[PDB]
Amino acid sequence: TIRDEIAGCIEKAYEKILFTEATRILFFNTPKKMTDYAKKRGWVLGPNNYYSFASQQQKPEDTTIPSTELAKQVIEYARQLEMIV
């Protein structure tokens, strides 16, 4: 229950972490747990390094998505104005 939290809490969000540097926390020598993490995370597996791409991640904007609830909140807000009235 700690080891899966290494994988969960390392990213997001770190730009990159070197290979042997993460091997210092996973212990062992060249475990298959980091291969299973190369599956579970996905995420990326790079040569002698690792990457959070892409990018950091999913890039929320959120553009016009929050404009719907921004209109929606004002709907019931105006309703509270009409309840006074």
Partner 1 sequence: VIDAFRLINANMMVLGHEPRQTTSNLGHLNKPSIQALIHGLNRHYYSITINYRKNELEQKMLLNLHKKSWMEGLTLQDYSEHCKHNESVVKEMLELAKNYNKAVEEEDKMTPEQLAIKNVGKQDPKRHLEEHVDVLMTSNIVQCLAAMLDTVVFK
Footprint on this chain of partner 1 (rule: CB under 8 A): 64, 67-68, 70-71, 74-75, 77-78, 81
CB of residue 29 to partner 1, shortest distance in Å: 57
CB of 75 to partner 1, least distance (A): 8
Complex with partner 1: residue 54 or 85, whichever CB lies closer = 85
Residue 46 bridge partners (DSSP): 49
Q: How far is the CB of 46 from partner 1 (least distance, A)?
A: 42
